[PDB]
């Protein structure tokens, strides 16, 4: 076999000032990938926060994000990783 061994992409739903955007990210996903795509999407460098229902938590390290992707992958009820974007 000399074809690619694709894993599942990570579906991300970004939110900034009432606007939501969905992008697929190839694994393994990195914080800087999310930051750079969020910059393309909204024109500014963003702080990134994970959100699930009422919970919000900043994502500041690669490990933080890895934890959030794990939650998404085990969650049969969630189909995207929700990231709230705040300027800075």
């Amino acid at each position: 076999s000399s074809s690619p061994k694709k894993q599942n992409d990570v579906r991300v739903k970004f939110e900034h000032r009432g606007e939501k955007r969905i992008l697929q990210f190839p694994r393994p996903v990195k914080l800087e990938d999310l930051r750079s795509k969020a910059k393309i999407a909204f024109g500014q460098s963003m702080d990134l926060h994970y959100t699930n229902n009422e919970l919000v938590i900043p994502l500041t390290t690669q490990d933080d994000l890895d934890k959030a992707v794990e939650l998404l992958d085990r969650s049969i009820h969630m189909k995207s990783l929700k990231i709230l974007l705040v300027i800075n």
Binding site: R11, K13, E19, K20, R21, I22, L23, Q24, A41, K79
Partner: protein, 102 residues
């Protein structure tokens, strides 16, 4: 010998362009669909507005804005996965509904 053939994305794509207080236009898309091409069709059917983007509703019921081809691909992929679930259960397939956005 036997091998798997291609699994198609989905069976024709209908994009329902919902127009504010005016109705909807069902565009049957011939089989890559580009973001540019969707904006061009919106500009034909909604000619006295200028449209830079559009929205769709995701599985959470949220309005998602599309501003790029990569975003288009994520929208389409989700749509196709919903259509495939319903096709297998004989549920009515609905078109992919979009909302033009200033």
């Amino acid at each position: 010998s036997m091998a798997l053939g291609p699994f198609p994305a989905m069976q024709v794509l209908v994009i329902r362009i919902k127009i504010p207080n005016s109705g909807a236009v069902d565009w049957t898309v011939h089989s890559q669909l580009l973001f540019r091409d969707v904006l061009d069709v919106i500009g034909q059917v909604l000619p006295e507005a200028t449209t830079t983007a559009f929205e769709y509703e995701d599985e959470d019921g949220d309005r998602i804005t599309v501003r790029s081809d990569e975003e288009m691909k994520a929208m389409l992929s989700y749509y196709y996965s919903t259509v495939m679930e319903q096709q297998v259960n004989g549920q009515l397939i609905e078109p992919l509904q979009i909302f033009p956005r200033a």
